[PDB]
Amino acid sequence: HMAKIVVTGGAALHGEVSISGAKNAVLPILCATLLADEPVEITNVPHLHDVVTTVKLLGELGAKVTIDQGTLSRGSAIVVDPRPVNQHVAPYELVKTMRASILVLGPLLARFGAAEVSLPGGPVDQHIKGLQALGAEIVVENGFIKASAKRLKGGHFTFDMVSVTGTENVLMGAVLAEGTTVLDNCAMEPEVTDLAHCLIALGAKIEGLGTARLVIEGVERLSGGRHEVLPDRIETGTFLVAAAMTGGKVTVNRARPNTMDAVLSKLVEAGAKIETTDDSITLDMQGRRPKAVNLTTAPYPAFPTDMQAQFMALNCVADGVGVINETENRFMHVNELLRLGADIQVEGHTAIVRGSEHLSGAPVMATDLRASASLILAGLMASGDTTIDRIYHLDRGYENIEEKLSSLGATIRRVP
Amino acid sequence: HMAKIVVTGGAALHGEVSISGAKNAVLPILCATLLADEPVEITNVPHLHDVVTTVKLLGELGAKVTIDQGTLSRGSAIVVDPRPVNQHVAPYELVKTMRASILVLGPLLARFGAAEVSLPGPVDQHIKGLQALGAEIVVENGFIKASAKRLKGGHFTFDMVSVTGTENVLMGAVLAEGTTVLDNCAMEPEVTDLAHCLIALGAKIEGLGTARLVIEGVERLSGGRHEVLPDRIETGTFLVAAAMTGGKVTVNRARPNTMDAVLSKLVEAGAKIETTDDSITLDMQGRRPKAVNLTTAPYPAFPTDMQAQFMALNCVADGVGVINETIFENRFMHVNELLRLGADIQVEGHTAIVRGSEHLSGAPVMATDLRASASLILAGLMASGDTTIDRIYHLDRGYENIEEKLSSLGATIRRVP
């Protein structure tokens, strides 16, 4: 099932917007509330199907959860009371739709000494091996991961492959373990660091933040408290790119600029004038078209692959030639940009984009986030109307990018 | 969206079923009707979303199409009148939902001297092959735009084997001026079935079933009739279901000489098998299946599209079976669901080791792809109690869901919306 949005191109974007929290921060953070003694308020929560599922999962585990729904200008506020949690078995009927559900394994094991989570549909060894390094007995039977541990005990563990959710799950197991834990080859994404910041706010002792080596001094209990989820750096970048490629001027509020260095530096190369505070970013093109940019995606803190499709759209309308290097087949959106008249040639992992002033609106299809963000952005400058058919599960309502782009002067409408 | 299928396991299957046509035969064959001067009747047509889309596409190009809907025992009959066809540009709104839409490029180009098809959401063998026949082809604004006053016979070698590439270029060659030789062609029986159809309409093609097709171009294709090749994968699925429940089934309107590798593997599992010119009878004579070993390989060797079903068979068989999947890239998606039923499966790279068991127990499982669906339904036939399969909406083929024909063989399966 597919609804349409219709973009009328041409206008420079002007105004201010705010973004909400990053998905890969909020999901483990919601699971971490199971570790706490008192209620925990999580603010800046985005609207995502996975957030809704996780809230439902916490409730079925026995937590009392309330949701103050977010708006265009602020994320949701979720209060989790973990005290009445009385289940260590995660229900398959909910878990089966959300791979992130593996993130309850660490907390439930630490809180209850036992935990059961279904194997995902479709990797998992880093979670099992890492928790075993803390002394858990873990077996897989009948498609369930079954874990038990009288008392988790600090130890040394090195990840074989870098894993964001692996790092998070083992970290949550370590904060209440007896003694000191050292994890090597940890994921370094800011979403991991935001989880660690949340745990510290609740009483955890973690050193080495932002690096591949985390040192955890186990404490007996975590308290309740409050945590504002790290702003979504990908959303922030998307609005900055949309401002840049329309020759406009936008200010993004409640941002976290020190998670965006590589992106902001690339926008400067495109001709943007950028100022940053401790919580805002202002981009001003001063009436200029963007210059085409070259980029290569690389692990954080280098240029993020999750911004590549958006910069490709920028290059499609920029002055000059831009070469994009993708280090997985990450160019599904190319043929859709070609329907708009873009000049893109793909050679292996490299896309060469020659920018043009003559993109023309046409019907296009978006079946994933990359196609969606890139096609909406291209639509902002294509002549006439771009009609984007988007798959149903991408719909985020008030946090669809087109809703905030409209508030910046774009002409975009949903046509069911 | 997810409907539920509930299987009660245990019963040996007995009876007869018939299967309808293979998808990868019917789709190019429907497109081939654009080449003809008179109406063409296509029989044994399966119910598939792509068939529905292709019928719509032909109508939007200007053909007049009628459908007599198939049943459990007979595929559909479609009559295509290509005479009023008046469009060489395939509409994006329809094309965008079906990658197989590229198969109108060759026919429209040959009939009209021009054709435009949207890029899909690879394609190079189709473009290069038609260029070898003298077509001018460019890609602009996301459309493949081809033109040729007159296609001309030539030589072309496919860089990699392409089923739909072979089909599209073949359709361009049959009305070309002069003689064409295509090398490194796909050898799947569905390709050969398209060639049989073209010959029935007047084409001259030699080398059927081989990597080299030799085509003497003719001036016109006539109208006529073609019965689509029976689906060998559906045939195998029902034979496997009979084998693993210890039953006895006859599959009617079969094409046994497209099934050699599958029948040989079922013999290895303990099946007693007879074949006529159009039927297959499998009899387990009250035995549990023996575990089998297999390595998927290009036709006519063991087909990857039968691998998940034989994995389910091995889950309930006597012994250990080694299954090596070297073709299907996203492999073994169904393994973790089979584990929820109690199966004993270990995976090492591209190889799964299955120790069969009499102790599979029904449980909730999820099927988001054809392999998961077929393997979980089959395993559900023998697991104790009830297996509850959540299946994604786009797999629903209604009366051609395998569970509908399995029910007619004594299975207890019900749809629970």
Q: From chain A, pick out residues whose CB is under 8 angstroms from the CB of B390.
A: 96
Q: Which residue of B has its CA nearest to A341?
A: B141
User: What long-range pairs does A149-152 form, CB within 8 A, spacing at least 24?
Assistant: A149/A109, A149/A113, A149/A114, A150/A113, A151/A113, A151/A177, A151/A178, A152/A109, A152/A110, A152/A176, A152/A177, A152/A178, A152/A218
Q: Do B336 and A362 touch (CB under 8 A)?
A: no
User: CB-CB: which of A121, A140, A142 is closest to B366?
Assistant: A121
Domain B1-19+230-417, CATH: 3.65.10.10
Q: Which two tokens stand for residue B330?
A: 């996203």
> Which residues of chain A have a Cβ shorter than 8 Å from any chain B Cβ?
92-93, 96, 118-122, 140, 142-143, 332, 335-336, 338-341, 360, 362-363, 365, 367, 389
Q: From chain A, pick out residues whose CB is under 8 angstroms from the CB of B339.
A: 119, 140, 142-143
Query: HSE-up of A295 (CA within 13 Å, CB side)?
Result: 30
Sign of the dihedral defined by the CA atoms of residues A216, A222, A226, A228, in that order: positive
Determine the Cα–Cα distance for residues B140 and B116; give it in Å rounded to an integer: 10
- Tokens 């932002």 belong to which residue? A210
Q: Which two tokens stand for residue A170?
A: 């083992």
User: What long-range pairs does B133-137 form, CB within 8 A, spacing at least 24?
Assistant: B133/B169, B133/B172, B133/B173, B133/B176, B133/B180, B134/B176, B135/B109, B135/B172
* Degrees, nearest 5: CA angle A337-A342-A346: 75
Method: X-ray
Q: Which two tokens stand for residue A387?
A: 């009609």
Whether residue B244 contacts residue B11, with contact meaning beta carbons closer than 8 Å, is answered with: no
**Binding-site residue positions of B for UDP-N-acetyl-alpha-D-glucosamine:** 99, 122-125, 305, 327
Q: Do B339 and A121 touch (CB under 8 A)?
A: no
| Architecture field, domain A1-19+231-416 | Alpha-beta prism (3.65)
Q: Do B121 and A360 touch (CB under 8 A)?
A: no
Query: B95 in helix, strand or coil?
Result: helix
In terms of Cα–Cα distance, which of A196, A210, A211, A189 is closest to A300? A189
CATH for B22-228, among 3.65.10.10, 3.40.50.1000, 1.10.760.10, 2.30.29.30? 3.65.10.10
Q: Do domains B1-19+230-417 and B22-228 have the same CATH topology?
A: yes
Q: From chain B, pick out residues whose CB is under 8 angstroms from the CB of A140.
A: 339
Determine the Cα–Cα distance for residues A379 and A399; give it in Å rounded to an integer: 18
Q: Where are the domains of chain B?
A: 1-19+230-417, 22-228
Q: Do B340 and A389 touch (CB under 8 A)?
A: no
Cis peptide upstream of residue B256 (ω within 30 degrees of 0): no
Q: Do B339 and A143 touch (CB under 8 A)?
A: yes
Domain A22-229, CATH: 3.65.10.10
User: CB-CB: which of A332, A339, A367 is closest to B141?
Assistant: A339
Whether residue A158 contacts residue A125, with contact meaning beta carbons closer than 8 Å, is answered with: no
Q: Do A336 and B366 touch (CB under 8 A)?
A: no
Q: Which two tokens stand for residue B43?
A: 């029989």
Q: Do B339 and A142 touch (CB under 8 A)?
A: yes
The length of chain A is 416
